[PDB]
Amino acid sequence: KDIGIVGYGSYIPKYRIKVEEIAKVWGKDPEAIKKGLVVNEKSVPSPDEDTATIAVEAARNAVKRAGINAEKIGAVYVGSESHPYAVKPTSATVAEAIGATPDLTAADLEFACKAGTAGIQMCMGLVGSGLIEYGMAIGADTAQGAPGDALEYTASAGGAAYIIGNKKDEMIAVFNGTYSYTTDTPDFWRREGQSYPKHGGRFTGEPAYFKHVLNAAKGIMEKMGTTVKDYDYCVFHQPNGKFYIKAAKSLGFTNEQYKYGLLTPYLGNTYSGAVPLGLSNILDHAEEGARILAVSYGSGAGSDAFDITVTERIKEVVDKAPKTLDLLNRKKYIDYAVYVKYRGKIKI
Amino acid sequence: DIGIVGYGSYIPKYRIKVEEIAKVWGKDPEAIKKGLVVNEKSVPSPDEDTATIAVEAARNAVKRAGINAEKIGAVYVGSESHPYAVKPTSATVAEAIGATPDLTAADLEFACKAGTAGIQMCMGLVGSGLIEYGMAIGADTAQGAPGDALEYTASAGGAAYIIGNKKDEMIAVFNGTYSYTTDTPDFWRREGQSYPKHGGRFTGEPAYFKHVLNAAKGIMEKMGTTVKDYDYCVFHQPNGKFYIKAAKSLGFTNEQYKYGLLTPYLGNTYSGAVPLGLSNILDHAEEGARILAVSYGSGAGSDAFDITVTERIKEVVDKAPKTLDLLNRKKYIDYAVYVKYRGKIKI
Amino acid sequence: DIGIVGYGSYIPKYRIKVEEIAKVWGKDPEAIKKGLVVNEKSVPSPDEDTATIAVEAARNAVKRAGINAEKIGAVYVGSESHPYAVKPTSATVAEAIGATPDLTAADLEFACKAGTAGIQMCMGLVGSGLIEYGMAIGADTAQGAPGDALEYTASAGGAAYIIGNKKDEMIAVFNGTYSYTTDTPDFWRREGQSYPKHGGRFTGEPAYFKHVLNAAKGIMEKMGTTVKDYDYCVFHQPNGKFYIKAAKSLGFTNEQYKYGLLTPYLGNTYSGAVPLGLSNILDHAEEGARILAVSYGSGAGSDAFDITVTERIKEVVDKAPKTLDLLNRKKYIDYAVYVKYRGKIKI
Amino acid sequence: DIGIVGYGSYIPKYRIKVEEIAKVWGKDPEAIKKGLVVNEKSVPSPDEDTATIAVEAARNAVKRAGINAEKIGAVYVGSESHPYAVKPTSATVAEAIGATPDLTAADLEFACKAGTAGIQMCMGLVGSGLIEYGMAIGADTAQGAPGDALEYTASAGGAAYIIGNKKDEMIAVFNGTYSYTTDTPDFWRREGQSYPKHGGRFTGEPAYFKHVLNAAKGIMEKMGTTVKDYDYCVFHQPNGKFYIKAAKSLGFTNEQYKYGLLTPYLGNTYSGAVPLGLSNILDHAEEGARILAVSYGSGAGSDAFDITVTERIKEVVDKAPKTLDLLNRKKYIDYAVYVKYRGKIKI
Amino acid sequence: VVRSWRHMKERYNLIGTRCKTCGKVYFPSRTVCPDCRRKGELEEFQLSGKGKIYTYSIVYAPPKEFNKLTPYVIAIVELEEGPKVTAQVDCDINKISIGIPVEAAFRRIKEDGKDGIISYGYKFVPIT
Amino acid sequence: MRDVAIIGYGQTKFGELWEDSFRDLIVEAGVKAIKDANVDGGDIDAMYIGNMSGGLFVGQEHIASLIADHAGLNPVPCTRVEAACASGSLALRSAVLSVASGHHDVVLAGGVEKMTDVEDATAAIASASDQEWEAFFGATFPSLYAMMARRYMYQYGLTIEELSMWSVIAHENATKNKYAQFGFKTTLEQVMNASPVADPLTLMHCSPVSDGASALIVCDADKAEEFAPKDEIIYIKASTQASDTIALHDREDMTTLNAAKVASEKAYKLAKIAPEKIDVAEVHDCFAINGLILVEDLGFCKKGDAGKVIDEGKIRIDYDDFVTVNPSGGLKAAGHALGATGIRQVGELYWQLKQDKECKDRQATIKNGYGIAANVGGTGGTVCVHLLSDKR
């Protein structure tokens, strides 16, 4: 009754904006921010791009890697913070755009930046239970940081999709186990009326991110009977580079182990696509037998941990779609004026 | 072998009649009562929201299950009126029932089908052996636009279901489930707007009936059944008229669909609509009864279920308030107090 | 030298009693009626606004003046509720009375003193010989914040005055005017917000009474008069209490201040309040009667006037509706219909 | 008998070139520069608003008048961007120059003619002997809608004028004034909206030119004059093209209209436009020079003035900053910093 | 609202029709074959989003909605299968030319104000 | 099947007419047409109208009833005919066929447009394109014709200078037209350097949004002699119409308007003449490129050579032995009031063939006595051709 990933895909838009271009406008030292956050630049979606289009790009690429007929997908789940509608499901738009309709279930997922991995766990259940043959879990966002605030340096756009399956011949990776840590924590939120979120500053750190990320990591390792030495690669949530590395070093992972999963310094924080995207970069590089630790975090508060092993099929599919690193490096820089124009940050 | 080990419901105490809304906007109440098959609807207290309703229903489901909430490995809340735009209701409910910390959770969105989407998610996690128990809730504090016809039906309520694997504690068993989904712009809301928009008569045949009826046919084919095999049925019920049209289209009689229809005195509770109707069916059902449940969400999509009741039902029905007791414990209010409570007066 | 040749008023037909607002918000109506000295207030029809009220009042003033509106060389509208943020009410009123095109106009803003500020402008333009007649209007469709005490007094109304130079046409004569103005943050509204904010108990002694009493004493010093020299008086009336406290402080009796006080059955019409009270005095006054009129605006500022009535008053009073007749032609509404009319319901 | 005893102006230090706006929105800057006859516009500091600009202009006018502000009996501020929706700018200005408390005040609204409306009001009160000195201000911190053509011209600035009765103190004398007014929906803004709306090419011939040319023709007919009788002229200047079309239509040459035209390097300061242009004329004019000044405001109306300069002008010009000196003390900014300052970034 | 729903499968997935009688592929799908009319028999047909620029223009002053995009490339793409479509091209103004190979992409085309629905559909991206 | 003639023509000025309402326009054009034809109001048996502004600009459909009502001609039947920019010519053809049938003897064919009252006019002129497969994706009406110009330049090597000469001529001719919207001369540089709308077209290549009205009185050829001197009568030799794909991308060839070829050929056949005998032509040149294409499709020159015949100026009035195109200034310079353009085109041929003083300063040489007009709806989905002659 093994469960694994039969295909995966990623997408990042082409525009970027450097820390220097945001700091120029607001009167801050860019080097201090770059070092403080461990971030150089972030991605920007085209004004004709949104969470749905980014999810569709990722979904379509994952179908390429899976090499299956999308009609077989029995569930599509989209985890996001920036669903283009307040009340109309992205997941339905994605299912139609990949040809999965009509014989499937779907839902839009909300749980800050963990929404994406919640959908993976949902697909694991439906496939393992035999309720569907394949399920798709997507995590994607076109984050918007509040203009004067520090989150504007990291709030980026991107997404990644994963297709979950039951057939060993088609698995590129296998779930060894999953575990989740969840409490009620008011570190980060947004009220229905407001344009941008609010947060508790230094409360977002130890009592929320590290509490949940680290409890989730040691929980799955206890469930699995493993140590840091047993894993080849790791990926944690990455609101900035600093938090990622602090968590990775706390648990005892070295650079070689955590290097692939960290994209924020040149991608930014894509929220519910953050860990899905880092994981996809690990898979674009991984070899057969590699063991991966993946742990997401969402504010509210909650984390999803995964223990995954790569199979021999990975080589066959990596080049079947664009690689996350290739997407991340085909880029066009823009200045703050064009950035706020694109993002709809100008009062009109 | 997957089933429901416990279930619970909640409805607030305040109601408002069609007559009180029509009086204000200058409409014939009898024409509305007959057109929509609706008499009154529920209203939440200003200190109540989707979260509190979900906790009431969740706590009631825990009573019927008779289990330790620490045993719950996932909590899923499906709604349209999550108190925050970005902060999960599901976490608040898990803390409020003692399920934290060893669990996963997510808030679900898919118009009025969000609640039943969560049931299917729990079915998967339990069936796969990934969790021992999962909770799926559907709840809403719907808001109708003041001048619009949706103000006559937009009500508050919710129901929770705990899904499990142990035959001895199952009160009902899932025989199968099926879902029909397309991209349909019949009903939506944009992030900025206060109230939703819709395509009027497009909400009917091409959206509600297409998905509800394709989903109903679909599961009966999957299971190889006919209308005569089911003792009870419950469909999405934005108004009384749509429910009955669908039920009669498929060949169900009044005795079969009557228990599932709550809108005429409850209103449309959106993602809580079918969960609540199903719960009323369970408060009445006897051993061996077979239920067809089909939800609808604008978008669009429907979730179908084929469920059989077991002998354990009699042990739990009285372990918590019955859906009909909640619905009939009520206090009436006028339109002025209604718009005060609901926050419909601009301040 | 300078006087009023004609004046006119307008009040809409709908009213709402204090009992109907307090009922909704859970307050004692008797305490409010006694605390504020207010029983009910006026409500404009949803098809009525400051412009329409200004037009009604302006047209009535033309009837009393008995002149050709083409001769009016300035039109000034003082309000807080100009139907546009940027498009002058005064232009619409001039077009609606046939005063266009040979005239100047402007919309005036200074809280509840805007209306009387325009009178002083017309006095200047007529006295200087720059125009032959000028019109000053004060009108508002005030909106009180739901749940706040201003909702019991915030009403709609307005009055217009035409100023002229011809003794044969003057119904009243200005003896003098004086104004007291400072920077006082007692009451304000920011461009984004729906309803104003205020300093509560700061609105009284340091603002209303400071300015109303300094303006009154000032003009009496300028004119060399005492309270006894005046037959009638009218002060700003945000509630009945403030009016009577001010009037009694200065030594006026009930017979002197009774006619100017309309708020207990009209509400506070803001920039139309003193203009309307003054008009009720003029509907009752006899030849030779001497009037003290003092307005107040938050900001803050007050405009004081010393006026003497002539023998022509009784020729024109019946040439248009009397303020008391308008005030008593009324239809009552409840809170639900009130918030519907006023646009206080979110959508 | 009525004249200007003092005048003052203010312009903030920041500018933005057409190129910086066009760059962002993907437009040809040369086409815009040539089409509108505009090169750059002024931008206020984020700690600057209409009130501070009005105080600067008023204080400068007091320097030139050389009088005690206590003697000012009226302060009128005309604007489209009063910092408050309900709290008078004029009061803050009166307090900030020491004119309080023995004065009247009002805030004026009539699109871009508000400022000149106050001059006529001061003319009336001074000529009538009701006050000894009155102050009329026109100031704005205009905001153009991002992406729209008004963003290339919407600028900040203001000018103040003190009106008096004493020949020995007059720097200029009013020969006459005239106004043309109708109801025209060329430009407006509703209370909720951030930026105005307009009728595009309806703003030209049927509105600006209709009113500007009828007003200019009107005062010349009232005065018995021709274009040849005037040394200088200044018209409203929403762009350079409208100004020049109007000026050439009436028969004025470059030497006559050159001084009044500031928009190409200042932008359109709305109610401060003509006051500022007039002030530059006065900074250059010589004894005996005769000026035609005609403003325009949407809704709609224009105020015309016929003014003659006196010998006292040279005594005061250097007593405060000259409008050209303010305009040329400048610091350029890019679009990002501009929208930051102006509060155009959603936050 | 309803009209978007009818052409979603065409706008999202480039699914047209092929007349069996003459073989000509049609996109957008046609109810009737113009060459065979009554004798034509149409079947559903999935197109590859691949094509080449047939002609193009650069829109310098579009409606206010497109203010973020202005100036944008609009083109008629000749698809590999035969049909031609009108669509925008996501490329730089100075790199569009007739004959450039392009490929369809799911993008946000239009939005019915801030309250109405969002309409998705095809936009073309160059190959390199 | 009776012969049809023209006995009168009337027109308002074309431009931004703020003062003139929609009523003021139709009346002025109708009265002028009535007066020119020497008929009384009672003599009109029916009316045929083209108009776009009403429904897109004001929400007014049922314009026919409105126009008959306010013209004072109730109860005469009035009918609205629509084909976007070709509504004018279709209203005429409808009128022609009604006289030919014998059901009416004297019929007014008119068109009117009030485009200045709308806030944004583009959405209306874009109505002529496919909303779901052209407009939806952001192809503005100028960009469609711009893509025609691009393809034509690609296939036949037309240079922007050659295209720009069309607009120079139009503006020169328009200074001779009191009713023209633009009465100024221009130069090649001014046209090319003007602000761009849609590459390669500039503002000086595109026709403007215009208010205006025009009206014709058509009559039975024999009854015409009751109102007019026989010499001042112009006969309608042919009134033909054709259709093409509504979308430009569905065209077999974008460099030609098949409906114009089809319609013009049928008219030439019915009149039994060849293109070489046409003395004056009025073509639909809302975007200049369309002027060149129609000169080719009507058969005055070979496909791809229009640019070279404009460069030498053979379409100019002073140039002899070649047809004279758009003596009035065409749509670009004289103005393009969508609904009236089809009527105006023919009224010019009427003036030109009858040597009316109205066109005295722009009078073309008339060797043979024939004129032709081509009115296009949208990018070519509808074309209507009218061929006139001084001989019956």
Ligand SMILES: [Cl-]
């Ligand atoms: Cl205004």
Ligand SMILES: [Cl-]
């Ligand atoms: Cl379908």
Ligand SMILES: [Cl-]
């Ligand atoms: Cl007649």
Ligand SMILES: [K+]
């Ligand atoms: K949401």
Ligand SMILES: [K+]
């Ligand atoms: K006097």
Ligand SMILES: [K+]
């Ligand atoms: K205001």
Ligand SMILES: [K+]
């Ligand atoms: K003073």
Ligand SMILES: [K+]
């Ligand atoms: K004639």
Ligand SMILES: [Mg+2]
């Ligand atoms: Mg006759």
Ligand code: NA
């Ligand atoms: Na920042």
Ligand code: NA
């Ligand atoms: Na034309």
Ligand SMILES: [Zn+2]
């Ligand atoms: Zn065929």
